[PDB]
């Protein structure tokens, strides 16, 4: 048996009604719990035994369903309700639904940083590209070194959605040997995002 | 009800780890204690339960033969020991108390009370403090500047700016795990370009697992300086 939650991500504005689904791949029980989890916190029990609100949980939360189809409904979202939600029965957890805040589209502000002189002293060069305060979360970074598209040599990470402005930020690091870095001149990161009518490229010339 | 777990662990592949969960505010023997783990950025995974009255247990098939749960009723503490550790075991481990008394003989799988979690990192890597490199201000509009906190192990590190005095526009990113087995993260801040001539920027980095603390000045490049 598997518990399947949908949607994977639900994007709604505060005040709207949220409906989250949890479907069991086979009948396991009509007991089902829902949990809420915020970043860096333990999960919190919201609904128990399918349809009961846990203590201290506000009335806007309700659960329903039986058999293999269950639903968590939040009548009208409050700011504190944006979080990840998991369903569970016996040993089984669903994979989670991320309930995120929908806000106006915001293009990233893009910045590029050369390797520091300090770092270069040690054989490695890291080039960093920052995409700042954008929405929605989906964004693409492409690195170019002397106009050659890079692959296989970068890593990135994305912040949790900001609790105050509802944006995301992203950091990408291109890793090169110091020799390769000193060998080439033009370093560029090209960013694609819904908020940009065409890709933006931030660049620098090494040594200049 | 309070559940309070032991502190973070770091282990080599093949080793074992034993996490504790001290319970208070209720009758310890009266309720099942479960363990649930979560790998960084991944979902919840149930590991097993123990009946603290009888000491009876039941484990997820994934961990059968490899996990042992025990308790000491004398000190209201439950334990989860996981052996033959592998890097895939890196996760936050939680204890959670079932909602209903065992005596009710009812559904024992509502996880009502949770401990704060215990990070266990499993890796062939060894504990190491970070190198902190400046990410120099991007303009002589808005400028970005930051610190690259590179090649440390294990998680976590904390970063502030100007001893906590500068919070607007700061982003400290989730670390990435490099192919080398060491972590790296960037912390950046956006600031008005006009402030670069006069305002000092220092990133304060603290990596408790190595008792390392570094305050790094981030200044404009020499070619961008005016004094």
| CATH code (residue A35) | 2.60.40.10
Q: Give A33's contacts in chain B (Cβ within 8 Å).
A: 109-111
Q: Give A116's contacts in chain B (Cβ within 8 Å).
A: 133-136, 148
In chain A, what are the helix, strand and coil shares in percent, each to the nearest 5?
5, 50, 45
At A178, which helix (H) or strand (E)? helix A178-183
Yes or no: say if B21 and B114 are a contact pair by the CB < 8 Å rule.
no
Same domain as A182, residue A91: no
Q: What angle do CA A176, A178, A179 make, to 5 degrees?
A: 105
Bridge partners of A69, per DSSP, are: A23, A66
> Considering only CA atoms, which of A74, A57, A64, A67 is closest in space to residue A12?
A74
Cα B130 from Cα B212, distance rounded (Å): 8
Cis peptide before A7 (omega within 30 of 0): yes
Can you spell out the DSSP letters for A10-55?
Answer: EEE-TTS-EEEEEEESS---S--EEEEE-TTS--EEEEETTTEEPT
Q: Return the number of other C-beta atoms located less than 10 Å from residue B124's C-beta.
A: 9
Cα B53 from Cα B28, distance rounded (Å): 8
Cα A44 from Cα A61, distance rounded (Å): 13
Q: Which residues touch A51 (CB under 8 Å, ≥6 apart)?
A: A62, A63, A64, A65
Same domain as A208, residue A110: yes
At A180, which helix (H) or strand (E)? helix A178-183
Same domain as A108, residue A30: no
Yes or no: say if B148 and B175 are a contact pair by the CB < 8 Å rule.
no
At A181, which helix (H) or strand (E)? helix A178-183
Strands A92-93 and A84-89: antiparallel
Same domain as A196, residue A110: yes
Q: Return the number of other C-beta atoms located less than 10 Å from residue A166's C-beta.
A: 20
Same domain as A91, residue A148: no
- B45/A contact by beta carbon, under 8 A: yes
Place of tokens 């790296």: B184
Yes or no: say if B133 and B217 are a contact pair by the CB < 8 Å rule.
no
Cα A173 from Cα B185, distance rounded (Å): 9
Choose one of A82, A103, A124: the last residue of a domain.
A103
Same domain as A168, residue A198: yes
- A187/B contact by beta carbon, under 8 A: no
Cα A208 from Cα A185, distance rounded (Å): 9
Q: Return the number of other C-beta atoms located less than 10 Å from residue A197's C-beta.
A: 7
Cα B44 from Cα A21, distance rounded (Å): 17
Same domain as A76, residue A15: yes
Q: Which residues touch B226 (CB under 8 Å, ≥6 apart)?
A: B197
Q: Give B136's contacts in chain A (Cβ within 8 Å).
A: 113-114, 116
Strands B9-11 and B118-122: parallel
- B47/A contact by beta carbon, under 8 A: no
Yes or no: say if A168 and A134 are a contact pair by the CB < 8 Å rule.
yes
Cα B161 from Cα A188, distance rounded (Å): 27
Yes or no: say if A206 and A182 are a contact pair by the CB < 8 Å rule.
yes
- A40/B contact by beta carbon, under 8 A: no
Q: Give A112's contacts in chain B (Cβ within 8 Å).
A: 138
* Residue B116 burial class via C-beta count within 10 angstroms: exposed 0-12, middle 13-18, buried 19 and up: middle
> Considering only CA atoms, which of B89, B80, B77, B43 is closest in space to residue A43?
B43
How was this structure obtained?
Answer: X-ray
Can you spell out the DSSP letters for A86-105?
Answer: EEEETTEE---EEEEE----
Can you spell out the DSSP letters for B115-163?
Answer: ---EEEEE-S---BPPEEEEE--S---EEEEEEEEEEEBSS--EEEEGG
3-state SS of A101-133?
ECCCCECCEEEEECCCHHHHCCCEEEEEEEEEE
For B155, the token pair is 């998680």
Taking the CA of residue B77 and the nearest CA in chain A, the distance in Å comes to 19
Cα B201 from Cα B215, distance rounded (Å): 10
Cα A8 from Cα A5, distance rounded (Å): 7
Taking the CA of residue B109 and the nearest CA in chain A, the distance in Å comes to 6
Same domain as A184, residue A110: yes
For B164, the token pair is 């906590």
Same domain as A83, residue A36: yes
Q: What is the resolution of this structure in A?
A: 1.6
Burial B173-209 (b: 16+ CB within 10 A, else e): bbbbbeeeebbbbbbbbbbeeeebeeeebbbbbbbeb
Place of tokens 């149930």: B46
Choose one of A103, A127, A145: the last residue of a domain.
A103
Cα A17 from Cα A117, distance rounded (Å): 53
Counting every residue written for chain B, the total comes to 227
Strands B67-72 and A3-6: unpaired
Same domain as A98, residue A159: no
> Considering only CA atoms, which of B144, B141, B140 is closest in space to residue B222?
B140
Same domain as A189, residue A123: yes
Yes or no: say if B62 and B39 are a contact pair by the CB < 8 Å rule.
no
Which one-letter DSSP state was computed for residue B174?
A: P
> Considering only CA atoms, which of B49, B65, B46, B53 is closest in space to residue B27?
B53
For chain B, state the CA radius of gyration: 23
Give chain A's domain count.
2
CB contact under 8 A, A156 and B144: no
Which one-letter DSSP state was computed for residue B93?
A: E
Question: What strand order describes the sheet that includes A61-66?
Answer: A3-6, A18-24, A69-74, A61-66
> Considering only CA atoms, which of B24, B25, B31 is closest in space to residue B54?
B31
For B113, the token pair is 């009370």
Chain A / chain B CB contacts < 8 angstroms: 120
The domains found in chain B, sorted by start residue, are 1-124 (2.60.40.10), 125-227 (2.60.40.10)
> Considering only CA atoms, which of A58, A49, A51, A95 is closest in space to residue A78?
A58
| B136: nearest CB among A43, A48, A113 | A113
Whole domain around residue A148: which residue ranges?
Answer: 104-208
Choose one of A86, A103, A120: the last residue of a domain.
A103
Q: Which residues touch A163 (CB under 8 Å, ≥6 apart)?
A: A79
Same domain as A84, residue A16: yes
Bridge partners of B16, per DSSP, are: none
For A196, the token pair is 């940009």
């Amino acid at each position: 048996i598997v518990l399947t939650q949908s949607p994977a991500t639900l994007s709604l504005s505060p005040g709207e009604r949220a409906t989250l689904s949890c479907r069991a791949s086979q009948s396991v029980s009509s007991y089902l719990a829902w949990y809420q989890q915020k970043p860096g916190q333990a999960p919190r029990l919201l609904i128990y035994d399918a349809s009961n609100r846990a203590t201290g949980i506000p009335a806007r939360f309700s659960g329903s369903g039986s058999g293999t189809d269950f639903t968590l409904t939040i009548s009208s979202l409050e700011p504190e309700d944006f979080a990840v939600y998991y369903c569970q029965q016996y040993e089984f957890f669903g994979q989670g639904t991320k309930l995120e805040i929908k806000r106006t589209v915001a293009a990233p502000s893009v910045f590029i940083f050369p390797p520091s002189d300090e770092q270069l002293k040690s054989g490695t060069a890291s080039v960093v590209c920052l995409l700042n305060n954008f929405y929605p979360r989906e964004a693409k970074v492409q690195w170019k070194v002397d106009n050659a598209l890079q692959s296989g040599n970068s890593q990135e990470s994305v912040t949790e959605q900001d609790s105050k402005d509802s944006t995301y930020s992203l950091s990408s690091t291109l890793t090169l040997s110091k020799a390769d870095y000193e060998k080439h001149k033009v370093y560029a990161c090209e960013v694609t995002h819904q908020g940009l009518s065409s890709p933006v490229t931030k660049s620098f010339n090494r040594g200049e | 009800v309070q559940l309070v777990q032991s502190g973070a662990e770091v282990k080599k592949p093949g080793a074992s780890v034993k996490v504790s969960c001290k319970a208070s505010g209720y009758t310890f023997t009266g309720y099942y204690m479960h363990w649930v783990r979560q790998a960084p950025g991944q979902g919840l995974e149930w590991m097993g339960w123990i009946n603290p009255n009888s000491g009876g247990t039941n484990y997820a098939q994934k961990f059968q033969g490899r996990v042992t749960m025990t308790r000491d009723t004398s000190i209201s503490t439950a334990y989860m020991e996981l052996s033959r550790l592998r890097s895939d075991d890196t996760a936050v481990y939680y204890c959670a108390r079932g909602k209903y008394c065992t005596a009710r003989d009812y559904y024992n799988w509502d996880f009502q009370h949770w401990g704060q979690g215990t990070l266990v990192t499993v890796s062939s890597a060894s504990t190491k403090g970070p190198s902190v490199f400046p990410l120099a201000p991007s303009s002589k509009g808005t400028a970005a500047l930051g610190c690259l906190v590179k090649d440390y192990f294990p998680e976590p590190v904390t970063v502030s700016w100007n001893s906590g005095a500068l919070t607007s526009g700061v982003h400290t990113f989730p670390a990435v795990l490099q192919s080398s087995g060491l972590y790296s993260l960037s912390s950046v801040v956006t600031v008005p370009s006009s402030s670069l001539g006069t305002q000092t920027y220092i990133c304060n980095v603290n990596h408790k697992p190595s008792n390392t603390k570094v305050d790094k000045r981030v200044e404009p490049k020499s070619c961008d300086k005016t004094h």
